[model samples]
Target chain A: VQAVAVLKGDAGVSGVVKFEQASESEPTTVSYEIAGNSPNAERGFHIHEFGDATNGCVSAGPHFNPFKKTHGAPTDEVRHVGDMGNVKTDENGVAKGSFKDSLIKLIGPTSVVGRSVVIHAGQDDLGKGDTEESLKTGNAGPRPACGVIGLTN
Target chain B: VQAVAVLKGDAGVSGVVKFEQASESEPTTVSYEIAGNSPNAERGFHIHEFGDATNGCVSAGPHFNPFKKTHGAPTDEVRHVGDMGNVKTDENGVAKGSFKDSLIKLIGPTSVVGRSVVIHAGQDDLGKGDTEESLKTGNAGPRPACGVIGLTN
Candidate 1:
C-alpha cells in the first residue's frame, strides 16, 4: 500500500510513505521521503493512533501502540508499532530513507492503512530519557505535519 | 489550494503537488515531491490532461494543453500549461523540488485543480527533438506513474 502526506501548519514538509508486504517470514518495508522540512534537524516520524486531521496534526491522537508497550526505538522489540524512529534531514531540509519493520501490517487488526503518519518538531528520545513523557511519546515534540494513510493498488 | 498524487504502476513512485497562490502580479508556485522513484534517471514530470488514474497513468490523457501549443520547456512562452518539465532523481531514487509557473491557476478557466500529474519513464525532451511525438510529449517515454490534483486547506 502507498500513502501520500500533505503537511500543514507551515511545517514546510511533505512526502510519501510506501508499505510493501514481504514474504511470510520477512518483515514489511516502510519506505519514506520528506521534503521542504527544517534543515539540520532530527524530526520525529511515526504512525499515530488516529487518521484524523480535522484540527491539523494534533487531532491524530497518540502513537499506534497496539502492543501496549512503551515508546522505544524502531529496533526495539518492546517499542510501539508507531515508533519507527527519527528521520534526519540534510541542509536542504530533505529526508529520504526506508526501513523494515516486523510490527507494521497492511491488513488485519495491526494494519496501519487507516492510521495517521506524523512528523514532530523535536527529536524522539526513543524512551531513553528520564521524563515520564518519554515512555508515553518518547518525548517527541509538537507535530508540525501530518497525513492519513490510504491504500494504493 | 493543494493536491495529492497517489502514484500507481510498478515504478514505485508517489508524492504530493501543492499549488500556492502568489501575488497578484506573480504566478502560482507549483511545488512537488515524488518518492520511491527509479534511481538516477531523469523522469518526465508534467501536469497531464485528466485526473483519472483508473486505467493507470495513460488514463490521465495528454498534457494539459489548453492553449493548443506545442510542447516546450517550463520557461517557454508558447508551451503547454502542463509543461512543467522534468524532475531528477538522486541515487536513492528520490525527486524533491518545486517550480513557479505563470500559466497555472487555482481558480478560473485555466485552473489545474482537477487535472492529473504524471511521471514518465524517461526524460522530457522539452520539445527540442525532431519527431512528431517529441513535439507532442517532449519525447517523454512510458507513463510509469500518475496522480490526481485535489484541493486542500
Candidate 2:
C-alpha cells in the first residue's frame, strides 16, 4: 500500500508524511513540519476533507467535521477531528511549523490517509465564540494556498 | 525510505523537498495529473530549486538543468532531465494528466527525486523560440504558484 500527497499549487505545506501499522501497541502518528506561501502574509492551517482543489480551496468541506456539529474554535473544547492547529509566517514571509495530532486513525473511516493539509491566507480564531457563524471557519480569508497529505513509502 | 516535499513562502520559489528509499525498488516511476480551477485557465508547469519563496518565485534555481545545457523547451530534442510535458485544463476547469518516464532514476547523485513543481500564471509557448530565453523556460510568465513533490507511502 502507498500514501501519496499532492500539493495543489501553493507551497506553504511541506510534503513530509509517514504512516505506521495501526495496532494496539504502536497506534499511529502523522507528523509534519509546515512550510509554504500564501497570497497574504499568514493564514490558518488545518487538515481538510477530500483531495479536490477544484473549488478554489473552500470546496474541501467544513474542516473535516466528522461529528456533524457546529464549527468551533481551534482551542475550543468541542472542535472537529480535522482541526489540527494554526501556522503563522514571520516578517521574512516564511511559515515554519510542526504538528502531531492523534485524531488520525490508521485503518478506520476517520483515517486521514488520503486527506490533505491546507494552509489558509488568514488565522484560526480558535473558536472564542465571538461570531455567530461556524467557529471552525475561523473568519479566515481566502485559500491563498493548499497541499494534499498522504502516507510515506 | 521516504520523500518529503516542503513548500515555503517565496515568490520566486515556493517549496523544498527530498526523496528517500523505502524498498529496494528505488522509486522507478513518478506520475501525476493536474486539476483546474476554470476550464478556460491553464498553468505552465516546471521544476525548480531553492525553497526561498521570499523573492517572489524567482529565487528557485533554473529548471533542473543537470546537463548544464542552455534551457530548452519541454519537448525539445535536447531538453534537460527535469523537463516534463504540459498539463492543459478543460472547459470544466479540470485538467487530468499522467506520464510515465523511464529517465527518472531510483538512486543516483543526479537524481531529481527532490525538487519543486512550479505553476506559472501564464502559458508556455512550447518551444516556439520567439525570444532569446531557452525554450525550456518556455517564455512563461511570472511564478503564480508552486508545489513540492513528495514520495507517498
Q: Identify the runs in model 1 with alpha carbons over 4 angstroms from their true place.
A: A1-9, A23-25, B1-153
Cα lDDT of model 1 by residue, B1-153, tens digit:
433444545667766666676443458787777788778878888888764434557667889988899999888887998888889999998888887778876555565654677888789999999898888999988887765664444
Q: What TM value does the first chain of each candidate achieve?
A: 0.91, 0.71
Q: What share of the true interface contacts does each candidate keep?
A: 0.00, 0.00
Chain A TM-score of candidate 2 vs. true chain A: 0.71
Restricted to chain B, the TM-score per model reads 0.91, 0.67
Task: Estimate, for each residue in A1-153, the C-alpha lDDT of model 1 and write its tens digit.
Answer: 433334445667677666666443457788777887779988888988765544567767889988899999998878998888999999999888888888877555566654678888789999999988999998889887876664444
Model 1 lDDT, residue B25, Cα: 41
- For residue A101, model 1's alpha carbon misses the true position, in angstroms, by 0.6
Write the residue-wise lDDT of candidate 2 on B45-143 in tens digits: 666643223233564556766676555545455765555545566786554555444344424544443345566656666556677664657776776
How many angstroms is residue B46 displaced in model 1 relative to the true structure, after the best TM-score fit?
27
